[PDB]
Amino acid sequence: VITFPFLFAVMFGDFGHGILMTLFAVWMVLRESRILSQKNENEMFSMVFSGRYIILLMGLFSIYTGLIYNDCFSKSLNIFGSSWSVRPMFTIGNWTEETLLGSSVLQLNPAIPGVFGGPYPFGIDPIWNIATNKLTFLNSFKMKMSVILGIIHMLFGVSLSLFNHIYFKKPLNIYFGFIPEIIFMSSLFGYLVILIFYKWTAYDAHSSRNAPSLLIHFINMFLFSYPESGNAMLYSGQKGIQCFLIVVAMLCVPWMLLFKPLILRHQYLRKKHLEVFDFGDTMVHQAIHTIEYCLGCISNTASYLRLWALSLAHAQLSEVLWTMVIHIGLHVRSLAGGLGLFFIFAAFATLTVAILLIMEGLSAFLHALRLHWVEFQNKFYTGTGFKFLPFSFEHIR
Amino acid sequence: LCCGPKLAACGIVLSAWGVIMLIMLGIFFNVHSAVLIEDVPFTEKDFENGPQNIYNLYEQVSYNCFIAAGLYLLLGGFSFCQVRLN
Amino acid sequence: ELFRSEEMTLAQLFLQSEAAYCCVSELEELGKVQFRDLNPDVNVFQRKFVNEVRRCEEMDRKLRFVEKEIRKANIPIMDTGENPEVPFPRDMIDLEA
Amino acid sequence: GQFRVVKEPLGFVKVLQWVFAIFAFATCGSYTGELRLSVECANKTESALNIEVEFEYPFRLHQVYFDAPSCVKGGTTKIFLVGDYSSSAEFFVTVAVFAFLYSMGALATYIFLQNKYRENNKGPMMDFLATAVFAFMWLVSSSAWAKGLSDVKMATDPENIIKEMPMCRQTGNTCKELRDPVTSGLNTSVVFGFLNLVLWVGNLWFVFKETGWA
Amino acid sequence: TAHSFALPVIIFTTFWGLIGIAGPWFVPKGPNRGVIITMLVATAVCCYLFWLIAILAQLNPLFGPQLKNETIWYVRFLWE
Amino acid sequence: NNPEYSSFFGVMGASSAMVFSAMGAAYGTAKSGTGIAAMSVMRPELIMKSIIPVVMAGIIAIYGLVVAVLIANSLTDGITLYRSFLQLGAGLSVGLSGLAAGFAIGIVGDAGVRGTAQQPRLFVGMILILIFAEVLGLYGLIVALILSTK
Amino acid sequence: NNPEYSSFFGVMGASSAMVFSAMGAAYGTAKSGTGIAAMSVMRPELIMKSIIPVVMAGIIAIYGLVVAVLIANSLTDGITLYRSFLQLGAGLSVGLSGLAAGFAIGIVGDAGVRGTAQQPRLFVGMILILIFAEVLGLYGLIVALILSTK
Amino acid sequence: NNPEYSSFFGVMGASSAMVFSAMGAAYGTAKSGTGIAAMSVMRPELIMKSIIPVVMAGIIAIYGLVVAVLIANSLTDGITLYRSFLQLGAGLSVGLSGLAAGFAIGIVGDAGVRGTAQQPRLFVGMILILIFAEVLGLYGLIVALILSTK
């Protein structure tokens, strides 16, 4: 009810398009009586109307996520005042009118103390919408956000599995699955989230020239291939801590795999002999479950980068549809530009509805559905029940 | 004149969206807000003596946006009239 | 609540053949139950009340023909929304007439 | 008409709340100020003899700047002023306008339609709610505007500007103030803020009687 | 233009923590209570985490933006 | 100093990442849309549920766009030839893996939609097979990202 | 240096942006027109609705035209080689992505039009699939603009 | 000193390791998916068992990804031409071995699924055949690991 709108909003983050979506959802909710009574074969309208209460939360949380991205139709709002400032580059730095004249795109740095004034208090700093190096920051931030959200969501599903196991009395499931399963997930990928937050809270412009790469360190962490040249270690004791983490991850695979078939063999073939138990089939079953758990962990952790992929696609499509439709009418010298804007805005509205709200909205919808169906539900929700379909007077239609 | 009720509904919704957005856009240009610099039609020789030279063009584009918003308001009125006929 | 599936249970009825119609009408109105087929080995046309089912289909054909003619005509169909549970006594014959 | 109502403890209080916050706008929203200083540089021929700069009531001072000397080659440097204080000053004047408009409307009700006001004590209830909201509005705006007026004085202070300006940090240079913007009007503005706050607190009982809750 | 990183965290942490912890108790005793509590708690998690990631991603930056000289010249005047 | 023609291979990385991903998405959409069109004539109500293959095909174009934009924003005049090669390698690794994923999505989607017309229970398996087909483009993206950020 | 031949790659970027987009549009118009002609023998009233695929095929060529004009205006005699490569990359990114989008539009339009002749409910499904196909050309355009103005 | 063009063979090793493994996995998934879809029309019960061929095909893509990640992680600008050739060799050995393994998986998976619909006894033999067709990817992976970590 909440995470699906929230992940959709992660994909579709744009405050203005979220406003439009919320307005549409509120229109449908308010007019639901008329819409309910005026039934017709319009598949699109009827299905969307049935989904109306989903779209309400979708629009509201796309509003929230667009504000956190500090984006509105590909433009930021700058309500709290930017943390990034330019004047210190001249006052304290060595810039000058001659430097501006001689460099077209120039630069900026926080090393001089006056430029950077802390994090913009609600979301991304507005200067990024006018900075050319925008995506160098946005892509890193969004990759890290995708990793964090995906890992936390998969961990949430793994945790939900326990509430099933206790009720159903699957003690072997509990002790040689979930506990090993969550230990595996936290040791391998939860540690990556911890590293992401550590790098954000620890490493700074003064460490810029030697700051490491999380991808490379994370992979060498699997390979046990600690290098001694190039980039430096993330923190003291990382070698030992990482070694412990990988070793526990390795041990967990046999821990999940072997004991369940072995204890089942014990209690259903040694006992009751000292429906029938098949050692080979059970071994294959639990080996299948473990191989799937681990390769699914890797593939799903990667698959949550789908969030960033869609976010970047949406952001760039909004940028182009602004900068080559309504930018046309804005960047004209004459006063007839108002009527030009009228027509160009008709075109802008139609194209934005067709592409961003419909195509990208639909893509985000189905991607959030896919994530919930597989990358999150594979952890706890078996989903092999029936729908209770009662003898209950459906014939009003 | 006359038109289909669906056409009139589309017209009024489009007019509302256009009015709101373009009024806001004109406001934000008249504010000289920085995030919209790239859309101002200034020329490379307008950067000599100070921000006023470009403030004037910001004002011009804001006036264009307000004019467009007025056009969309008139369209919205006409579409509301069409809906009333239907 | 929506937290997890509602507790569910099977039950069975021994029910006077005369009172079966009344009870199934009341249970249709109630709508908190799902019947299951106990005699699937014999096709659904070879069973007892299928003759009454056929009579109901003839009635529905009559009503749908009249409804189509009404659609062809200009007079509105009323949407009052009355939802009575049909009784057991043979109102079927009066309605057929 | 009910012109005699304007004499009464409620009508008179409304006249007070109308002349006040109007004088507050006249003192705050009308403000445009100026600043001057002078410098004798280590090389006397490079002296910045005269400086003049100006500002307005919204007090977005950081967008204001003046060409100070650099005491090198006689070239100048662009000294911007310090900070902005809209949240104090603009908020205070906006509250003043709100109160002015509401009290004008209240006098309009009193003079011609006070029976409609007294009907079912709904007019008294709405005026009591208005007084309650304006108490908070003036309280917060007046505190923020006291701090903001102190900030305006500290930001505009020519001696503060000289201390921030690094010329005195070089040897040989001398710098001094030449003019400091007038303060009486803005002091009167904040004084009006406090007076309006106390009146809005006091009128609670004056309307509580009419609501019947007194 | 310093946004000291104590006030924003206090504000939004108390905000979202209250939404996710105290609001559940204020939801009335009714049938939809459980679903409503779940919405409150999980909205707290999702939104608070999103904001926290966004603000920490800017805490301690490694580099500064890159700007066309025109926007440098403009923002130099406009912003503090 | 670094050679003048170095930027060519990086630019080709960007253009390839976009072009081959677009080809994969185009083939996937074409075959899936033909399947949906054949399915509709008999089973209209499945039309919307059966658009999912088109969406998963579009994911591949989005992946190509991500890598292409990343490389384009990473390009520079003085790009070292090593970085140019890294960008070309990432561009191809995402573009051609996305092309393969588009082939897989198109064929699986066409056959699966046609089948789901005849037997609704196939839908879940069709979704699983489409996921396995799309994770190929995802792996291509992973390799492209590792190469490029390295 | 900036060799004397440097503008060759930019000119080829412009030529590609136009030629390949035009071929995509020509295919997306040929297949769609054949489908419309085959359908109209029995559903003459569906012609105007079913012309939409031709319109989107033309939109592909308009993307190509935009990028080609942009490159041809950015060309200069002293165009540095790095900029020339950027323009070639933009040209291919728009042109061949538009070609893939045109193939997708042509196949989808043909199949969906022949379908909507027999099942009218397929029309809006066609519209969605065609928008997905044309979004491939739009992605090509986005990457082309980024490269060209980089 | 090591030549500037050395890294080209390493980046092609990574790109090949991923691209050809992806093509093999795509063929294996696509043909097995069409087989599953055709089977599901009559025997819906067998979808979740018959999915196994697709898992086997995906494991080939995982092999490709692992080798590509090893190569990409081992890349540098000064990478000696010997190590660059070793990485190209690893990339080819895993990419084309996975290509062959995926083709075998696709063919045998389709045939085995369709036969298992007719004759359930065929399932165990299909598993054995898939394992023999898939360990080719594992042999390619072993050779690629040796060459890449050498």
Q: Tokens 């089942």 sit at which residue?
A: A264
* Contact between E3 and A121 using a beta-carbon 8 Å cutoff: yes
> Residue H48 sits in which domain range?
1-150
Question: Which contiguous run of DSSP H or E holds residue B2?
Answer: none
- Give the torsion sign (CA, A281, A284, A288, A289): positive
- Give the separation between CA F103 and CA F111, rounded to whole angstroms: 12
| Interface residues on D facing E, Cβ-Cβ cutoff 8 A | 62-63, 83-84
Tokens of E8: 């924003």
Q: How far is E62 from chain A (nearest CA, A)?
A: 4
- Give the separation between CA A113 and CA F145, rounded to whole angstroms: 33
In this complex, does chain E touch chain B, defined as having at least 3 beta-carbon pairs under 8 Å apart?
A: yes
Q: What is the 3-state secondary structure (H, E, C) of A265-299?
A: HHHHHHCCCCCCCCHHHHHHHHHHHHHHHHHHHHH
Residues near G93 by beta carbon (within 8 Å), at least 6 away in sequence: F14, F15, F18, F19, F68, G140, G143, G144, G147
- Give the separation between CA A297 and CA A187, rounded to whole angstroms: 12
* Contact between A374 and F55 using a beta-carbon 8 Å cutoff: no
φ/ψ (deg, to 5) at A331:
-95, 60
CB-based burial label for A218 (10 Å; 0-12, 13-18, 19+)? middle
Residues of C in contact with E32 (CB under 8 A): 1
Instruction: Name the method of structure determination.
Output: cryo-EM
**Would you give the end-to-end CA distance of chain E in angstroms?**
6
- Give the separation between CA F75 and CA F71, rounded to whole angstroms: 6
Residue type, F9: F
Which residue in F9, F12, F19, F43 has the most chain G C-beta atoms within 10 A of its own C-beta, making it the best mutation to test that interface?
Answer: F19
Give the number of other CB atoms < 10 A from CB of residue A70: 26
Q: Provide the 8-state DSSP code for A84.
A: B
Q: How far is CA A287 from the centre of its chain?
A: 30
In this complex, does chain B touch chain F, defined as having at least 3 beta-carbon pairs under 8 Å apart?
A: no
E34 interfaces chain C, CB cutoff of 8 Å: yes
H helix count then E strand count, chain F: 4, 0
Q: How far is CA D167 from the centre of its chain?
A: 33
Stated resolution in angstroms: 3.6
Binning chain B into helix, strand and coil, the percentages to the nearest 5 are 80, 0, 20
- Give the separation between CA B55 and CA D63, rounded to whole angstroms: 14
Q: Tokens 């007025």 sit at which residue?
A: B70
Q: Are A4 and A372 in contact (CB under 8 A)?
A: yes
Name the β-bridge partners of D76. Answer: D69
Give the number of other CB atoms < 10 A from CB of residue A383: 9
Give the number of other CB atoms < 10 A from CB of residue D191: 15
Tokens of A66: 């667009």
Rg of chain H in Å (alpha carbons): 18
CB-based burial label for A364 (10 Å; 0-12, 13-18, 19+)? buried
- Give the torsion sign (CA, A289, A292, A295, A299): negative
* Contact between A390 and C8 using a beta-carbon 8 Å cutoff: no
Instruction: Quote the Cα angle for A141-A146-A147, to 5°.
Output: 100
Residue type, B69: A
Using alpha carbons, select from A103, B55, F77, A121 the residue that is nearest to residue E72.
A103
Name the β-bridge partners of C35. Answer: none
CB-based burial label for D69 (10 Å; 0-12, 13-18, 19+)? buried
3-state secondary structure of A116: strand
Using alpha carbons, select from G94, G88, G89 the residue that is nearest to residue G12.
G88
Tokens of A266: 């014990």
3-state secondary structure of E26: helix
Residues of H in contact with A295 (CB under 8 A): 59, 62
Question: Which contiguous run of DSSP H or E holds residue H119?
Answer: none
DSSP string computed for A342-378: HHHHHHHHHHHIIIIIIIIHHHHHHHHHHIIIIIIGG
User: Which residue among F85, F114, F143 sits closest to H68, beta carbon to beta carbon?
Assistant: F143
Q: Are A58 and A8 in contact (CB under 8 A)?
A: yes
- Crossing angle between the packed helical segments D86-118 and D184-211, to the nearest 10 degrees: 30
The nearest alpha carbon in chain F to H19 belongs to: F97
For residue A278, give Cα distances in angstroms to A177, A264, D182, G53, H84.
20, 10, 97, 59, 50
D52: alpha, beta or left, given left = phi > 0 and alpha = psi -120 to 50? beta
Q: Provide the 8-state DSSP code for E71.
A: H
Instruction: Quote the Cα angle for A25-A31-A35, to 5°.
Output: 105
The nearest alpha carbon in chain H to F85 belongs to: H8
Could you give the number of structural domains in chain H?
A: 1
Binning chain E into helix, strand and coil, the percentages to the nearest 5 are 70, 0, 30
- Give the separation between CA A142 and CA H130, rounded to whole angstroms: 39
Using alpha carbons, select from A41, A19, A21, A23 the residue that is nearest to residue A31.
A23
Q: Are G75 and G7 in contact (CB under 8 A)?
A: yes
Q: Are A264 and A170 in contact (CB under 8 A)?
A: no
Tokens of C72: 């062809």
φ/ψ (deg, to 5) at D40:
-105, 110
3-state secondary structure of A75: strand
Q: Provide the 8-state DSSP code for H39.
A: H
Residue type, H6: S
User: Which residue among G124, G131, G142 sits closest to A317, beta carbon to beta carbon?
Assistant: G142
Using alpha carbons, select from F122, F49, F103 the residue that is nearest to residue H39.
F122
Q: Are H79 and H6 in contact (CB under 8 A)?
A: yes
Of the CA atoms within 13 Å of residue B37, those in its CB half-sphere come to 22
- Give the separation between CA B74 and CA B11, rounded to whole angstroms: 11
- Give the separation between CA C91 and CA H83, rounded to whole angstroms: 93
Strands D65-69 and D32-40: unpaired
Using alpha carbons, select from D175, D164, D47 the residue that is nearest to residue A91.
D164
Tell me how far apart the 2 most distant CA atoms of chain E are, in Å: 61
- Give the torsion sign (CA, A376, A380, A385, A390): negative
Laid out side by side, the sheet with D48-56 consists of: D48-56, D32-40, D174-179
Q: Provide the 8-state DSSP code for C73.
A: S
φ/ψ (deg, to 5) at D108:
-60, -45
Using alpha carbons, select from A215, C83, H142 the residue that is nearest to residue F147.
A215
**Would you give the end-to-end CA distance of chain B in angstroms?**
12
Q: Are D38 and D176 in contact (CB under 8 A)?
A: yes
Residues near A376 by beta carbon (within 8 Å), at least 6 away in sequence: A3, A153, A154, A156, A157
H helix count then E strand count, chain E: 4, 0
- Give the separation between CA G97 and CA G135, rounded to whole angstroms: 10
3-state secondary structure of A72: strand
Question: Which contiguous run of DSSP H or E holds residue B31?
Answer: none
- Give the separation between CA D51 and CA F40, rounded to whole angstroms: 81
Strands D174-179 and D32-40: antiparallel
3-state secondary structure of C34: coil
* Contact between A215 and F149 using a beta-carbon 8 Å cutoff: yes
- Give the separation between CA B42 and CA D189, rounded to whole angstroms: 41
Give the number of other CB atoms < 10 A from CB of residue B37: 19
B3: alpha, beta or left, given left = phi > 0 and alpha = psi -120 to 50? beta
Q: Which other chains touch chain D, taking contact as 3+ CB pairs less than 8 Å apart?
A: E
Using alpha carbons, select from D133, C82, F138, H37 the residue that is nearest to residue A374.
F138
- Which residues 55-114 on chain H approach chain A with CB closer than 8 angstroms? 59, 62, 69-70, 73
φ/ψ (deg, to 5) at H102:
-70, -40
* Contact between H73 and A223 using a beta-carbon 8 Å cutoff: yes
- Give the separation between CA F45 and CA A44, rounded to whole angstroms: 11
Q: How far is B80 from chain A (nearest CA, A)?
A: 17
Using alpha carbons, select from A388, A389, A390 the residue that is nearest to residue C33.
A390
- Give the separation between CA G62 and CA G140, rounded to whole angstroms: 12
Q: Provide the 8-state DSSP code for A334.
A: S
- Give the separation between CA G20 and CA G60, rounded to whole angstroms: 10
Residues near A214 by beta carbon (within 8 Å), at least 6 away in sequence: A192, A195, A196, A199
The nearest alpha carbon in chain G to A132 belongs to: G150
Chains F–H, number of C-beta pairs less than 8 Å apart: 152
Q: Tokens 């979202």 sit at which residue?
A: E16
Q: What is the 3-state secondary structure (H, E, C) of chain F?
A: CCCHHHHHHHHHHHHHHHHHHHHHHHHHHHHHHHHHHHHHCCCHHHCCHHHHHHHHHHHHHHHHHHHHHHHHHHCCCCCCHHHHHHHHHHHHHHHHHHHHHHHHHHHHHHHHHHHHHHCCCHHHHHHHHHHHHHHHHHHHHHHHHHHHHC
Rg of chain C in Å (alpha carbons): 18
* Contact between A316 and G128 using a beta-carbon 8 Å cutoff: no
H helix count then E strand count, chain C: 3, 0
Continuous H helices in chain C: 17-30, 50-72, 91-96
Using alpha carbons, select from D133, D130, D121, D131 the residue that is nearest to residue D211.
D121
Instruction: Quote the Cα angle for G22-G27-G29, to 5°.
Output: 90
Residues of B in contact with E75 (CB under 8 A): 34
Structure-derived torsion over alpha carbons of residues C27, C28, C33, C37, reported in degrees to the nearest 10? 100
Rg of chain E in Å (alpha carbons): 19
Q: What is the 3-state secondary structure (H, E, C) of chain D?
A: CCHHHHHCHHHHHHHHHHHCCHHHHHHHCCCEEEEEEEEECCCHHHCEEEEEEEEECCCCHHHCEEEEECCCCCCEEEEECCCCCHHHHHHHHHHHHHHHHHHHHHHHHHHHHHHHHHHHHHHHHHHHHHHHHHHHHHHHHHHHHHHHHHHHHHHHCHHHHHHHCHHHHCCCCEEEEEECCCCHHHHHHHHHHHHHHHHHHHHHHHHHHHHCCC
Of the CA atoms within 13 Å of residue B41, those in its CB half-sphere come to 17
Strands D48-56 and D32-40: antiparallel
CB-based burial label for C80 (10 Å; 0-12, 13-18, 19+)? exposed
Give the number of other CB atoms < 10 A from CB of residue G128: 20
- Give the separation between CA B62 and CA B28, rounded to whole angstroms: 8
C-beta pairs of C32-37 under 8 Å, 24+ apart in sequence: C32/A390, C32/A392, C33/A390, C33/A391, C33/A392, C34/A388, C34/A389, C34/A390, C34/A391, C35/A391
Q: Are A172 and A264 in contact (CB under 8 A)?
A: yes
Residues of E in contact with B37 (CB under 8 A): 70-71, 74
Residues near D203 by beta carbon (within 8 Å), at least 6 away in sequence: D13, D17, D131
Which residue in E1, E69, E70, E71 has the most chain B C-beta atoms within 10 A of its own C-beta, making it the best mutation to test that interface?
Answer: E70
- Give the separation between CA A252 and CA A384, rounded to whole angstroms: 28
Using alpha carbons, select from E44, E51, E41 the residue that is nearest to residue E9.
E51
Q: Are F106 and F28 in contact (CB under 8 A)?
A: yes
